[PDB]
């Protein structure tokens, strides 16, 4: 592995050799040729767990929803050659994807009608996502089935090699983690997770980016000071994927169970968002659910307090606009006039 | 922060942004030109400290040292010019480099930085680990490092410097001087490590891998030699190498069998012992080895006079007191 | 600019500052994005050709047909904001694609409502309407090529975002017929060289003289090649072009091989094609004085499978000539069949 | 053919696969290896060209002085083992280098190459351009560039080396001696030329871009000093350079007013002549000078010793008896 760093400013530029983190967090999901395993193992496994009972599968990330998307036609097509009477369907993805207690297992047999490769060109369906949690219930559907051999980078476009598990696990894909520090910040990524650490005076979260709300436990072998750490103190819970790190505290503020997470994606700033001012002070309001400054009218509230946590503030830059943390409160006005965060971890 | 990335196993390339841990220890020396904050004002350190009665210095890494070497010949004027007849001796060091139990004050008369000098500046109270590097963060495209004393006490190294990366089943943990790599082969484990020195500061957990559920028993660079507490720090079937080559100046730990040599596995062998040489000091190598409960492949160190093997596999009849043998402990 | 060349076979990269050239031939796109000039001036522009009285457009590449076809619901909300009748709708792409004798003109003002940027993911698409502004899409029956625009859209900028890629347009002052060379990257060094587009990549080597070698092309454009991006343009006569001029073929002595004439006649029908010197297997070809006269070329297989293994020519030099197409493998214009009658062979029904 | 390649301007980067032209004016003592294939061969060329009397060669590039300065010590030897009282003398070139009507044929005392020897005997008794080199391609790793006697009659430059590229609105004529650029300013324009060298070998068509339609004395750059015929080796205005600053040991020809003066343009102006330079011997600037007609930015040369001034611009009030004048002519 060899790389090489530029800085337009300065208009020069430093080689060499070592490990290099790229930032695929951005909008670069779609057009990478996904290849969900061999097609003639594929089909055999789905009817296999379908026959078995476990119907539906709940996507672990949102590159699972863009592959099943992507291959609906292509297995669509397989089945019927195949003599399978089934039609996969799938839909958009919801926030946060809840889990699954089974998995899909290895079938032993493949079949004799299949295709060499995906590149070739009913009433009962194996729904993946969208407005059907209770159809095939949480408690009857696949999760976290897939385990990424290889992810390559061709001349115009990128490709995956995938396979399906052989025993049970709530990590996420390791295969994918990528995990780099240096000097004094830190980083944690992922297919869609971007944290960033700093050191003010002590580790902190400085900022994260969140391109989709998750479920599995991320893998402790990819994760920075793992040890002394007590779960109510993640800014993000251990239940959606946070590091289990120091990296991942803030003095003052503890976990955010209750947050924004029905947004399609977050990016965790600390600082006073337009139109507010904040105030500390021991008789402000208690903790609860995270709060809207904007209001269901427009208006913004202009005046918050905190009771003991400090400054600058907790927010949440969600697309539609500014969270703050469960600590902040209304200084003078009731706190009914506002929509809350109304989810758990 | 931008940059692009070749790979030779897959033809394949890469370009984005993102953070870029680099392999330093290669561009050792040939690269930075350390200095501290005002050379006047170090020289009021060294001056309080030479005032203190505090005989000298230890290099904690060769970036002090070799900082130290030039600006022997430009802060000696200074302090002989204003009054003191004071001067600071520089000289090639020797390994492994021990820790200094005292830190230095915020501010013929040899001022001693280790080297052949136990005699000058015994280790009772040499100084040590008084220096800060302030942190560039990714640290990229600045040569001109910075220094200051620090003004509270602490074991670990400096993180200015080090980097720790982790991408799919390769991992590292890097700093000035070491190259600690890992692999998944149905666990982490070590893999290979490439050492240009050796270290007594401790490694900071802020820069760790998988740090809880440690056994320090099971580590292979014990704690004292700057390991990190980490998985990724072990290998399966042997234990810390307490005893070792540790008196080299390049250490390549690699896990082959050593050229000419042979093992043969058998639980009636011999016992642990110290480290041994391949060969004997006439060069004759020693086709006989054993141990009792290794896993392939074995364990063995790559240095400039002769590879050598771990505590944890023997020779089988070969006398052991012929070969040169461990003579420190980390 | 500086760059750095791999070659995998070792741990060889050898950097510097330069001229790079790449290929980008292997029709990539849809990972692009257009913005052709701006949603309120294309869209005037569009406006007024309509009432001008000319139809449609002949596009000159595969490029403008994408980049036309991934802005036409947006164009059609732009233009039914207005309450204009009229409607944007793209077909495929035939080959040859023939030359326009029109261009759109530059607006005199941008509509008074619409947006600024190629780039909101929500809107309304438009409802259908009679008015209909095609671009080529198969419609030459209605409205033919003599009232479509062609060639009318000049690249300024070529960029290469993080992620994805993205380029910049405007519609042209000038009539012109060559084409957009901003685009175009010529090369040579030692005894190769390269000419090369959006859809072409035209390969020459040097052996006796200086002839061509091979021609891969995923388009059958009819602009001419801008001199100003050739390579020894003088002394050459059209009837020793390989590639047709009319088929933007260079104007150049790179574009030759002893022998052959230019190839007025072939397989352009096609959706691809890559000229290669090398008899295709299972077939031979050998001189003779009495062989045929010159003809269209002919496929080497007949409609029903059956395949010809002998061939002749008048003064071909070997390897012989062959168009490499997706439904089989075509003979140049110059070589015939050994005794079959002509009349048993698909022929080529292009001219050019 | 697969690289990648970074833009600062637009602060771009991508990767691809396609040609490639690099730039190896400045830095190419070191890069690639010239050498002959054979010096027995070349040796027996020489022995027969002595036999025939030439005096010796008048090197093409630099990168043939390079190769005979380098097989020197091997031809002393053989040239001594054959039983040849000969000896080659290889020297500094001197700009410009000059044309020789003889080859070298296929296979006092000396053999002498470019030096201030003319006294020797005359121009009319050297070779010049008798050498083929291997033409790699697109090899940029081949550094091992062969050296062949030619053995056919020809006046072009060897394309080996040559290297034309166009990428949109820019362009370069390129060899191991010359970096040529242009720019598209509304028309196809010389825009800078840096010179390590004066050849006088043609450049060949095979290599050239808009090959049709010049004439000879619309070149900047003289076709006799290996100028291209295209239309890109043109700026509106200004005709050949056929005197001109030629002697310097290395050129930078740039469109811009040398420092500390300005250029005005009136047809009160005087007429073309011989390039004079900005600054006279005793140091005096000049910061008035005329033009006829030639548009701005003044044609220059940023050369070692000064700043001079194309054939058009003459000093507006001082006559030129005051100033140097460039004695070369080609």
Not at 25 to 48: F, G, I, N, T
Not at 278 to 297: I, K
């Amino acid at each position: 592995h060899v790389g090489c760093s530029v800085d337009f400013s300065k208009k020069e530029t430093r080689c060499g050799t070592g490990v290099f983190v790229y930032n695929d967090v951005e909008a670069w999901r779609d057009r990478y040729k996904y290849h969900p395993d061999s097609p003639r193992r594929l089909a055999a496994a789905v009817k296999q767990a379908w026959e078995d009972g476990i119907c539906g599968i709940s996507s672990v990330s949102r590159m699972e929803n863009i592959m099943w998307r992507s291959v609906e036609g292509e297995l669509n097509a397989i089945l019927e050659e195949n003599g399978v009477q089934l039609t996969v369907v799938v839909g958009s993805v919801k926030n946060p994807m809840w889990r699954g207690p089974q998995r899909l297992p290895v079938p032993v047999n493949e079949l004799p009608h299949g295709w060499k490769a995906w590149g070739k060109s009913t009433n009962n369906s194996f729904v993946v996502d969208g407005d059907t949690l209770k159809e095939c219930p949480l408690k009857h559907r696949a999760w976290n089935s897939f385990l990424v051999e290889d992810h390559g980078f061709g001349v115009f476009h990128t490709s995956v090699w995938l396979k399906v598990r052989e025993d049970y696990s709530l990590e996420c894909d390791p295969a994918v983690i990528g995990t780099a520090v240096k000097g004094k910040e830190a980083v944690h990524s992922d297919l869609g997770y971007w944290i960033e650490s700093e050191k003010n005076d002590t580790w902190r979260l400085k900022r994260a980016h969140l391109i989709e709300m998750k479920t599995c436990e991320w893998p402790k072998s990819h994760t920075l000071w793992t040890d002394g750490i007590e779960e109510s103190d993640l800014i993000i819970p251990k239940s959606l994927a946070g590091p289990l790190s120091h990296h991942n505290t803030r003095e003052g503020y503890r976990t955010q169970m209750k947050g924004p997470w029905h947004s399609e994606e977050l990016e965790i700033r600390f600082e006073e968002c337009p139109g507010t001012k904040v105030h500390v002070e021991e008789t402000c309001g208690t903790r609860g659910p995270s709060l809207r400054s904007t209001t269901a009218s427009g208006r913004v509230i202009e005046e918050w307090c905190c009771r003991e946590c400090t400054m600058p503030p907790l927010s949440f830059r969600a697309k539609d606009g500014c969270w703050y943390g469960m600590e902040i409160r209304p200084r003078k006005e009731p706190e009914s006039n506002l929509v809350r965060s109304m989810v758990t971890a």
